[PDB]
């Protein structure tokens, strides 16, 4: 009774503190600057190959090769410049909800309803691809994986908890407990000192990698936060959700600075990502399209028409020259 | 340099060849999402996740969803390429059968599971008959509509089945098929079956059910029904 009353008072005091920080609004001060305007990204190529729906994808640091996981059980390593198969890896479990490329360009991660972020070695001296380390230490489905480096990898899951793993040892080093519902996505910072993670409780959380604790808890969503991605500078992040709106949260300001919303849109966001500039907030929606939002003024600059079924994932290159959008009709379309 | 671009391209032809070989076996195989409940005859028909079985030169791939935890709004989305959701329920467990009716209504009215047909297995049918003939826990208390519900005319019970049990048998269906008919679309149809653990021929019931679904899918494509 007393602990529950004190917990409710802490949440009210946290919102009241950040309300004082809200002197102006982001949309209010960014009205004067000129927008991106009419933007119409053509499809560069169409990566046809996957059998079933593509659930996830992620670029490499090289800004050429990209990996994508599909529900048939294949993890195809593409090459954007040449639209060809670098590698085609058969998974243990057919169902796979995430995949990620290592910053070095050596290892590749994947996982889903098996509850294992299976790491695969690309540069194998024998010949074929081989399972480097199976990271089985989660109660529920693996929802996202991101490599800090080749030595260690951060994970989210359907066990209500994120976790840092070290593949050399083969066990979880630091655990991240705090969310109420199952976590859906995560995004590493540029410095890789801390990371964010959106969950089905409708409240993102900034976790510190070294310490092993939540820095602050954000809340500016009505429904499940599906995706999450860091802003290029590393001081803010966007979050796609089932409430059919995206929300930018400043890490310094500690609140929702801006809401990207269109009342005509009635369906949730699956994936989100920024460009190198931090201008084009590219969010993938359930209605078979992806809206090119202006991160500055919160206005719909353009739209990505193409796919038959929903866009599940959306990644952007490190140099910021190309963008990819994996979809449930199994055709990865690259745009630039 | 000139060799390297073609070398990976000739290697990608083998990747395409392995992928196209993978597409042949995958497209032929049928996925099935067999979900149920705690103590509801889920393990009887199929605690393994995946179960491959060849019946009449048709490979299946029946996937249980037991290892993950009960919040099932974001992992159930992974099964819309699935051919048929085998929704198994305990007929005798009246208190928790209402949770299964709510679970059916969620699965049926979901956007991503809108295209999927549900092969319903009302499991523990002979064990339902034990509870109904006893008459300790009345159906009217947990479902007031039963007191003003008569038996269907098109109902076909097995020999030596009591009209008392027959009323209870076809009423459990009614609440499930009320939700099935409430769509008003015709993208997917519920296939109810009365089953027990001892009654072995359930994969045959799935085979005949899945036949009619993908028949309906082809007929519907050509605008013919």
């Amino acid at each position, epitope marked *: 009774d007393q602990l529950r009353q004190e917990a409710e008072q802490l949440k009210n005091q946290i919102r009241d503190a950040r309300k004082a920080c809200a002197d102006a609004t982001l949309s209010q001060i960014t009205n004067n600057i000129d927008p991106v305007g009419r933007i119409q990204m053509r499809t560069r190529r169409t990566l046809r190959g996957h059998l079933a729906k593509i659930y996830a994808m992620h670029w490499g640091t090289d800004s050429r090769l990209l990996v994508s996981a599909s529900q048939d059980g294949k993890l195809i390593i593409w090459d954007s410049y040449t639209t060809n198969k670098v590698h085609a890896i058969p998974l243990r479990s057919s169902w796979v909800m995430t995949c990620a490329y290592a910053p070095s360009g050596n290892y590749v991660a994947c996982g889903g309803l098996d509850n294992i972020c299976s790491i695969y070695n690309l540069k194998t001296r024998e010949g074929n691809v081989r399972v480097s380390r199976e990271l089985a230490g989660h109660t529920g489905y693996l929802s996202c994986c991101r490599f800090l480096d080749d030595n260690q990898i951060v994970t989210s899951s359907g066990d209500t908890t994120c976790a840092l793993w070290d593949i050399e040892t083969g066990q979880q080093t630091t655990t991240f407990t705090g969310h109420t519902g199952d976590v859906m996505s995560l995004s590493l910072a540029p410095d890789t000192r801390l990371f964010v993670s959106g969950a089905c409780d409708a*409240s993102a959380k900034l976790w510190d990698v070294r310490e092993g604790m939540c820095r602050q808890t954000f809340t500016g969503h009505e429904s499940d936060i599906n995706a999450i991605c860091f802003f290029p500078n590393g001081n803010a992040f966007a979050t796609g959700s089932d409430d059919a709106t995206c929300r930018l949260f400043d890490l310094r300001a500690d609140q929702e600075l801006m809401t990207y919303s269109h009342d005509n849109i009635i369906c949730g966001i699956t994936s989100v990502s920024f460009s190198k500039s931090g201008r084009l907030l590219l969010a993938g929606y359930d209605d078979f399209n992806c809206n090119v939002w202006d991160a500055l003024k919160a206005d719909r600059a353009g739209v990505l028409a193409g796919h038959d079924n929903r866009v599940s994932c959306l990644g952007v290159t490190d140099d910021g020259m190309a963008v990819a959008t994996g979809s449930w009709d199994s055709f990865l379309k690259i745009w630039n | 340099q000139r060799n390297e671009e073609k070398a990976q391209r000739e290697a990608n032809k083998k990747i395409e060849k392995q992928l196209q070989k993978d597409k042949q076996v995958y497209r032929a195989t049928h996925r099935l999402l067999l979900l149920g409940a705690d103590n509801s005859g889920k393990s009887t028909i199929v605690g393994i996740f995946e179960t491959k079985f060849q019946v009449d030169k048709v490979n299946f791939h029946m996937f249980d969803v037991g290892g993950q935890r009960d*919040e099932r709004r974001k992992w159930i989305q992974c099964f819309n390429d699935v051919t048929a959701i085998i929704f198994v329920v305990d007929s005798s467990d009246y208190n928790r059968l*209402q949770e299964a009716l709510n679970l059916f209504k969620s699965i049926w009215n979901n956007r991503w599971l809108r295209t999927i047909s549900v092969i319903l297995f009302l499991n523990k049918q002979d064990l339902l008959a034990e509870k109904v003939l006893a008459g300790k826990s009345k159906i009217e208390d947990y479902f007031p509509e039963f007191a003003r519900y008569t038996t269907p005319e098109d109902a076909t019970p097995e020999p030596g089945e009591d009209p008392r049990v027959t009323r209870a048998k076809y009423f459990i269906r009614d609440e499930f098929l009320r939700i099935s008919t409430a769509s008003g679309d015709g993208r997917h149809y519920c296939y109810p079956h009365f089953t027990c653990a001892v009654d072995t021929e359930n994969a045959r019931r799935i085979f005949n059910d899945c036949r009619d679904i993908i028949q309906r899918m082809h007929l519907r494509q050509y605008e013919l029904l």
Partner: nanobody
Amino acid sequence: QVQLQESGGGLVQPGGSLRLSCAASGFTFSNYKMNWVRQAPGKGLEWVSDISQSGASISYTGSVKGRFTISRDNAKNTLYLQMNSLKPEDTAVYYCARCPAPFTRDCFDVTSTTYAYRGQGTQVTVSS
């Protein structure tokens, strides 16, 4: 912060009545399908009754069919449950619970504790 606050609830004699009222906040109340979930002494959670976004397609559990009555105020953002003729079996912690997605008719609530779109709950009790 997506909170639902259950007002009302308490002790009442068997055969009487008690009107629950759940104050909702932190989201657009009109866009979501609402429902009540009860937890009896030494038992798991179970669905009681739901209500649509417009407030038309209403459904109940058989134990509470005719006796209970659900309703909603979309303007002020709150849910109701006018319970009448309360039996000894009805004693439970009644949580008002919003469904996860908006613009829909599917709900995967009634979770094992972990479900954020649900209040702290009011202890409704029946004794004589």
